[PDB]
Ligand binder design. Structure first.
Ligand SMILES: *[C@@H]1O[C@H](CO[C@@H]2O[C@@H](C)[C@H](O)[C@@H](O)[C@H]2O)[C@@H](O)[C@H](O)[C@H]1O[C@H]1O[C@H](CO)[C@@H](O)[C@H](O)[C@@H]1O[C@H]1O[C@H](CO)[C@@H](O)[C@@H]1O
Ligand SMILES: *[C@@H]1O[C@H](CO[C@@H]2O[C@@H](C)[C@H](O)[C@@H](O)[C@H]2O)[C@@H](O)[C@H](O)[C@H]1O[C@H]1O[C@H](CO)[C@@H](O)[C@H](O)[C@@H]1O[C@H]1O[C@H](CO)[C@@H](O)[C@@H]1O
Ligand SMILES: OC[C@H]1O[C@H](O[C@H]2[C@H](O)[C@@H](O)[C@@H](O)O[C@@H]2CO)[C@H](O)[C@@H](O)[C@@H]1O
Ligand SMILES: *[C@H]1O[C@H](CO)[C@@H](O)[C@H](O)[C@@H]1O
Ligand SMILES: *[C@H]1O[C@H](CO)[C@@H](O)[C@H](O)[C@@H]1O
Ligand SMILES: *[C@H]1C[C@@H](N)[C@@H](O)[C@H](C)O1
Ligand SMILES: *[C@H]1C[C@@H](N)[C@@H](O)[C@H](C)O1
Lengths: 378, 7, 7
């Protein structure tokens, strides 16, 4: 158990720029004598709640904002209090992503949106529609390739297709999310999941495909397309594949509607280094220099810090990131998000494996997502 | 729901 | 002990 007075332990996902973050932490230590240790545990977002209070948790946790409302409901995150002048440094909607029950509960870092990534050599003109993917596969198969591979095991990657024709998580009503009104079993959701299952049934994709499989396949030039976020561009760069980043395909004429994450830094409410954490995040990390260090390790996306984002906006890959983000939605941060993701994960796996029909799978998801639950689990 | 806890 | 589950 590693938290100590006068030091900082930080958790961040292993696909993100943790080496670049450690370098900002090295500068923080030179200036203040406060040692910064960056770790990237597996499933850090699941690990956090049970080890935050007394266990081997971090002083700071980096994850997409959707998990944070749940943490805050259990009293696990320190309220943050940036002054108006600091808040004016970041885009206003990023602060909203980390506001829960009237309070700011994390520092926004970057907007992460999924994009269509394609191999320009295999596919100089990527498809505008999901509907044309089966034919494109048949063509590419004839040449020993495949059209599209992406991570099917995480609902984050499949949601954009499910949402395209009308699927939604929770209904927004009377200025709040109605946790009893779940939209994963409506006509549009069924159409989206049906198209996905069919891709698998007709052998255009493999139901067991996961993150590492899709990444290697794309970076080794075996598949023409993948779906992934900005963090993934660094490894493609190393692979020397000639790639483009572009708008996701439409479904039934409607844009894919990814749920968009705001990478955020939360401060452990039981940390004895909360003031230290605030200083690191405000004065070191959220600066042109700090973000550049993390970004050059693994790209962050459209950063929350205006001054730096204005420099990044020149990048066509960022422009594509922003375009997909605008066609999707910043995730709700309500505690019920984890139940929602769990319901969709289960439905997608069950439908893709043939263990349930789409209709059966989604009906169950709607029921489960809506089940009442208190702040400690369920 | 359907999972456990406690957080 | 003292934790939960279910795995
Ligand atoms: C599961 O735990 C909850 C308690 O959860 C806590 O309090 C609720 C009010 C709050 O919403 C939540 O966030 C937490 O703070 C109990 O209320 C449930 O009854 C309990 O359900 C399981 O155990 C009961 C019996 O005690 C069973 O009747 C249920 O069907 C659940 O069964 C689970 O354990 C069984 C193993 O024997 C499995 O069938 C199942 O995994
Ligand atoms: C599991 O715990 C829940 C919730 O417990 C209550 O609410 C939580 C928040 C609080 O921390 C706790 O002290 C309680 O106030 C209970 O409602 C479930 O009944 C309980 O299930 C276990 O125990 C019942 C019998 O009472 C069994 O039928 C279940 O199968 C569970 O038993 C297993 O789970 C435990 C942990 O692994 C083991 O003791 C046992 O193997
Ligand atoms: O798949 C469900 C999962 O999606 C999101 O997690 C993303 C995360 O936002 C990204 O930063 C990156 O790490 O990929 C993850 C999915 O593999 C939600 O943030 C998360 O809570 C949810 O479980
Ligand atoms: C409660 O919230 C935690 C953190 O998001 C989840 O990991 C857990 O499964 C449950 O949904
Ligand atoms: C049971 O095993 C799982 C997987 O290692 C843990 O995450 C859990 O905390 C418990 O030790
Ligand atoms: C369930 C038992 C143990 N995990 C506790 O820490 C939580 C609060 O309730
Ligand atoms: C507890 C409920 C859910 N987590 C199940 O997957 C396990 C086996 O039991």
């Amino acid at each position: 158990m590693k938290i100590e007075e006068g030091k900082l332990v930080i958790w961040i996902n292993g696909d993100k720029g943790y080496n670049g973050l450690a370098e900002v932490g090295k500068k923080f230590e030179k200036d203040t004598g406060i040692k910064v240790t960056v770790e990237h545990p597996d499933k850090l977002e699941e690990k956090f709640p049970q080890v935050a209070a007394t266990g081997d948790g971090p002083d700071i946790i980096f994850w997409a904002h959707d998990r944070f409302g749940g943490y805050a409901q259990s009293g696990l995150l320190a309220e943050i209090t940036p002054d108006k002048a600091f808040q004016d440094k970041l885009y206003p909607f990023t602060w909203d992503a980390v506001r829960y029950n009237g309070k700011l509960i994390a520092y926004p870092i970057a907007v992460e949106a999924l994009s269509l990534i394609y191999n320009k050599d295999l596919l100089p003109n990527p498809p505008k529609t999901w509907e044309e993917i089966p034919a494109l596969d048949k063509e590419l198969k004839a040449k020993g390739k495949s059209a599209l591979m992406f991570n099917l095991q995480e609902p984050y990657f499949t949601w954009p297709l499910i949402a395209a024709d009308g699927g939604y998580a929770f209904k927004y009503e009377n200025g709040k999310y109605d946790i009893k009104d779940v939209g994963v079993d409506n006509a549009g959701a069924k159409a989206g999941l049906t198209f996905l299952v069919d891709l698998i049934k007709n052998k255009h994709m493999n139901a067991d495909t996961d993150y590492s499989i899709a990444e290697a396949a794309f970076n080794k030039g075996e598949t023409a397309m993948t779906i992934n976020g900005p963090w993934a561009w660094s490894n493609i760069d190393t692979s020397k594949v000639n790639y483009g980043v572009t708008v996701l395909p439409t479904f039934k004429g409607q844009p894919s509607k990814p749920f968009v994450g705001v990478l955020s830094a939360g401060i452990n409410a039981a940390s004895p280094n909360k003031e230290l954490a605030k200083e690191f995040l405000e004065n070191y990390l959220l600066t042109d220099e700090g973000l550049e260090a993390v970004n050059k390790d693994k790209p962050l996306g459209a950063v929350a810090l205006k001054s730096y984002e204005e420099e990044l906006a020149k990048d066509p890959r960022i422009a594509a990131t922003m375009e997909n983000a605008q066609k999707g939605e910043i995730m709700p941060n309500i505690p019920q998000m984890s139940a929602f993701w769990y319901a969709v994960r289960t439905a997608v796996i069950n439908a893709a494996s043939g263990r349930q029909t789409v209709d059966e799978a989604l009906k169950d998801a709607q029921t489960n997502a809506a089940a009442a639950a208190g702040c400690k689990x369920x | 729901x359907x999972x456990x806890x406690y957080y």
